């Protein structure tokens, strides 16, 4: 992966992968489509994978539904 002895960027993310979501996550949690795609592309995951990881984050908030 994109560090030395690491996992591959399948599903499953490493510590520089979740580094750069996290740093997005701050300012903008609403992620797009269209820039899901790009992170898709350069992690080089899936779009499907990165989408979960957003979905899961903010349910993690004191909101209405879920949590």
């Given at each position: 992966?994109?560090?030395?002895?690491?996992?591959?960027?399948?599903?499953?993310?490493?510590?520089?992968?979740?580094?750069?979501?996290?740093?997005?996550?701050?300012?903008?949690?609403?992620?797009?489509?269209?820039?899901?795609?790009?992170?898709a592309?350069?992690?080089?995951?899936?779009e499907?994978?990165?989408?979960?990881?957003?979905?899961?984050?903010?349910?993690?908030?004191?909101?209405?539904?879920?949590?």
């Open positions: 992966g994109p560090m030395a002895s690491d996992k591959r960027p399948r599903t499953a993310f490493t510590a520089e992968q979740l580094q750069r979501l996290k740093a997005e996550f701050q300012t903008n949690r609403y992620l797009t489509e269209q820039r899901r795609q790009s992170l592309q350069e992690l080089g995951l899936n499907s994978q990165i989408k979960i990881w957003f979905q899961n984050k903010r349910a993690k908030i004191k909101k209405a539904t879920q949590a």
